[PDB]
Symmetry: C3
Amino acid sequence: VDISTLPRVKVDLVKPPFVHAHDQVAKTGPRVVEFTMTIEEKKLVIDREGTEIHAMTFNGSVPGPLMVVHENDYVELRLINPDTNTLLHNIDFHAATGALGGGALTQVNPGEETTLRFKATKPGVFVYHCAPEGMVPWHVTSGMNGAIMVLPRDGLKDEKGQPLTYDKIYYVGEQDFYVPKDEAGNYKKYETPGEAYEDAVKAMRTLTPTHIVFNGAVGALTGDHALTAAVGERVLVVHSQANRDTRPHLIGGHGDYVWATGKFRNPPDLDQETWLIPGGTAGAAFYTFRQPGVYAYVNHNLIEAFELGAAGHFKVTGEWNDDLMTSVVKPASM
Amino acid sequence: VDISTLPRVKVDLVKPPFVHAHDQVAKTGPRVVEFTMTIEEKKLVIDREGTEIHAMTFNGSVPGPLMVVHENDYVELRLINPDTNTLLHNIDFHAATGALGGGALTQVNPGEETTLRFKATKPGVFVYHCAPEGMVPWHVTSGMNGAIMVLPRDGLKDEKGQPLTYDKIYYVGEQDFYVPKDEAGNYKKYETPGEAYEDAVKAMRTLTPTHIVFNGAVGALTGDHALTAAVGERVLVVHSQANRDTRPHLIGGHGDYVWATGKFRNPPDLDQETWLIPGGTAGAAFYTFRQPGVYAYVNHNLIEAFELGAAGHFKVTGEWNDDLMTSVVKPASM
Amino acid sequence: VDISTLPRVKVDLVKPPFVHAHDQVAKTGPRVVEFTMTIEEKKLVIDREGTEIHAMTFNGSVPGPLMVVHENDYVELRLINPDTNTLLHNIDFHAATGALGGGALTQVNPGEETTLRFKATKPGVFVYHCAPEGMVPWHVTSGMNGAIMVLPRDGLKDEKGQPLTYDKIYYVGEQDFYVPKDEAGNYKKYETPGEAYEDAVKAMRTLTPTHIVFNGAVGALTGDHALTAAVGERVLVVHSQANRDTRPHLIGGHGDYVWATGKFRNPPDLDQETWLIPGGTAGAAFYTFRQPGVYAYVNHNLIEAFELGAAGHFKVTGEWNDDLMTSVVKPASM
Ligand SMILES: [Cu+2]
Ligand SMILES: [Cu+2]
Ligand SMILES: [Cu+2]
Ligand SMILES: [Cu+2]
Ligand SMILES: [Cu+2]
Ligand SMILES: [Cu+2]
């Protein structure tokens, strides 16, 4: 059908871990869904020590925002590279077919913009990332990645084909950073991107992240920015990792239904404690909360979680179920 | 139903890789299944060189013992921290719902004990581990982890819904250790836990294990402690890894039915050569032996297996099947 | 049935990434399928810098060639170790049952040969590799591994049981090398295998590959050796990794049907962006091309892909579909 005959809808994105408005079950026929993102090179402080890096972002955040469409919609993205940036950038959608996911068509120097359209022919959560030829892992591991969710037109389904409807959704982007270290182990900083590049390559070639964070920094999804839920709410957590495997775990909960490799035509795995999201993938986990209190949500390499940054929190409201768990004898002498 | 009306049964645990007595198919209604574990901080020699570490254990072993219940039983654990220990400990069950898996309710100083109860609402094999706030990966990577199996009340089923009944079960706990090294590469020892802690953190932050072992030491599941089976026996191998991914493989065999991420509501994967158990998970593999002789059971990063310790053996009794395999021409000149 | 009554067919192998002739659906009853491989120790240049290693190969290549049979055929392999080699070698088939996959029966010194037969009782793609007791990871990580495909007798099937027929097949072997480095970071070379062995062990124990390549070298599956396809062709890519996990991704495409852990009795995963092939496994991905142009095929740890070597290309012929993807506004000022 002629694409100029289709409805157009403009999305206004939100910063992760929040997700822009959308309907689970498609309330219209196929649409051209219009998005705009502005690339921002910016300094970011990523840890409690004050370590500051030169991040490369879509729309000012690490991760980039979650885009949401339905299967067989068209995604039309206007990608802007303002002249205040210094580098060449582009975008590759793992949801898309052809031209390196769009990367071959979206190369923008500072001061340029472009508009890409693709048909979202496969349902699932997918990574998107910058990928300039010859500099790909540098851009991705500088934070230049996010995700897109392509919902089935009739929403999510369980392993038996019955509906799964979330009440809340969050997007956790997990980022491995490779901050270059001197021989004593202290981070180096650099005066220009070119002067940094060889030691970024050197740091990356060790394959050992210095930091692994959610939402761009140690502690970002804690305190006043903890995720929230109520007992009995159905929550979908989309989780991406553009470059290394991760093993998400909700401490005190489960993934009731998990698409570990993120593709909704497949039945979910049930009752997961932990699951493996391969580097280069988005996964999604659905959970109905049953207990109030604090939860941690981690990469279950616990060194990565608690020493390198890959941990966030939920604060859950509601009543405690002593049938599901109780302290019979509280800690006491002997 | 009122929990005080339920039967109580006391389990007496056994040391891994053996598993305490149980019935695959539940012979009673739901029960409160009572367990006791005593925490033991102890020196352990982990390799053939004599490297000795200060391990932190549940019940004196690495891994902690396998607990076995059925779905919708209640697990009631008395956790004892004797005054001969020096540290604070607790326990998080990945099988449980709420309070950080129990960790928020089970904090015991030396000289204290506690009793936790939870409902085992989801069937599968699950990790349990110590997780004291601010010291989590140190305790887990000191050996303070084990697993619990929550059987379906009607036992295990194959991908078609027919029964799978094991004749024997073993529990392989796989442990990544991070023994601190000086600049020359030799292990350091320490005089107190506090004096060790920073270099343990430093060692962990390299993300590179020094040792990866089954049942607490290089070679533990070999020789007089090799696993055993007979041709035609059905064996379930439960395998856990609380902190890093592993890729188990039976050299000379297969996983006929594998729950790689350990959750029995899902159909197993058939005919696996190797499978991925993510860090923070227990998996289970069912195999019917068809050939006698020696088998190795490994993490199939073969460096991890054969240089770092992640290898055990089966000794299998019975008759050789030349239809399945034979040497047509034995090795000879030309 | 008496094996001497069965047909014999001799296969003539081809060098990867190509695959010898075969029929998807079995056109005969069960056969003894005869293969010959000659071990070759040889120098190989593995990167653009000219780094040369002493590789250990089956049939002169890294990976060894793909062998193809059907379920319940017998594989009969004549393995030759010419006297021009210096080491002991053998072979373990993950497809086989008993005697360490054949390794216990196939130990050949230089100047010896042997013939092994096994029944291919399970359908899937499987690793094969050398595994001499006490030297296993050295041989495997020197390149001495390949794969075997055991097709179902009625060919491949989708998640619904309908046929999947490929038009083309390729075999990508992915190799992690551990070239020993001095303290300055430069590669060492060695005068004999014995003089190399300790530092190979030392290099392996770091767990950090120096190189991760497809088809034996950086860039091997590019340029005049890029993989090829046409729009509308159905392609199966078999991918093995004998020692470390990998996360394959077709840049600009998908895995339409993926057996990530390689075993065809299981339904494939649909619509994958990226998938996890555990170390010690072969996986297979089926894709129907929809767009022409250049694709990259990578391990989606992009550092591993673009800095360490784990990247190849497809060149795809045919017409561009602007409905699936188009540049609406090409990159331009503002
Ligand atoms: Cu960029
Ligand atoms: Cu990508
Ligand atoms: Cu502890
Ligand atoms: Cu845990
Ligand atoms: Cu060899
Ligand atoms: Cu193997």
